Amino acid sequence: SMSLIICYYGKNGAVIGGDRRQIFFRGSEENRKILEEKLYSGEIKSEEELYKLAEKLNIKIIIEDDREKVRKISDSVVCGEVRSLGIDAKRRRVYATKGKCAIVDILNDTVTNQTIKEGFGIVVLGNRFLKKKAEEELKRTAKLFPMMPIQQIEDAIKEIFEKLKWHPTVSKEYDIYSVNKYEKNFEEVIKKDIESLFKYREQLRKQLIDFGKVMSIVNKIVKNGEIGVIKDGKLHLYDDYIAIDKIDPNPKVFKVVDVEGNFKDGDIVVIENGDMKIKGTNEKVTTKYIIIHK
């Protein structure tokens, strides 16, 4: 979630800093909201205040600080991201190279806004409180950045992260990266990075689709039915039914199923309460396969 990213771009290069902290809340949507407002307004000054207020509101907190939010893609490009994963996956990414910066907004699998900037400036992403304080701290050095060596800008940005990291939306560790080369294919590099996000999301989607196929197979298992007729020692299933070799997202399907037991050709196979037997005789029918409704 929203902590702090600070990004400079100018003729001397680009510099980005960001922390790593994510906070997950579990509990009522309304109390969640109350907690976030106080967290992002500056009312909540420490972790102890946060944990205390959360327990009073019946919200469980999970803080995870393994989220790298800024990266260095190459000699010429740095980037950062803020995001909110809820019902919707909301992201705002900043990319920067010497002399240029881009901001891209993404809702789920759609780019909803983009901004490209050339010249020099600063982009601050994060919560209101930290955004404002960083901007306030920045107004004292930001004018000087275009005339500074890169290391001094790094330092100026570190200083701001040192001054603000007491805040509980910030991790203990933060990352600073800079580049001093111009990326000639800036837009392509951004495009490729964004496509990777979409590929990754399409993979998660496939995993969830597969889970749903499996659950759907499990709910379709036959507990009751007249399912077919014995022929050549095999169960020839009726149209409403099919067999599968195992519970899997895309299993081998069978209409004609190897079975064992005391029956003969023309005997009708039934299942009642999940017990497979011969109609009339009531003799037991075993199989390796799983029978499901079409």
From Swiss-Prot:
This is Uncharacterized protein MJ0548. The lineage of its organism: Archaea, Methanobacteriati, Methanobacteriota, Methanomada group, Methanococci. It comes from the Archaea. Pfam families: MJ0548_C, MJ0548_N. InterPro entries: MJ0548-like.
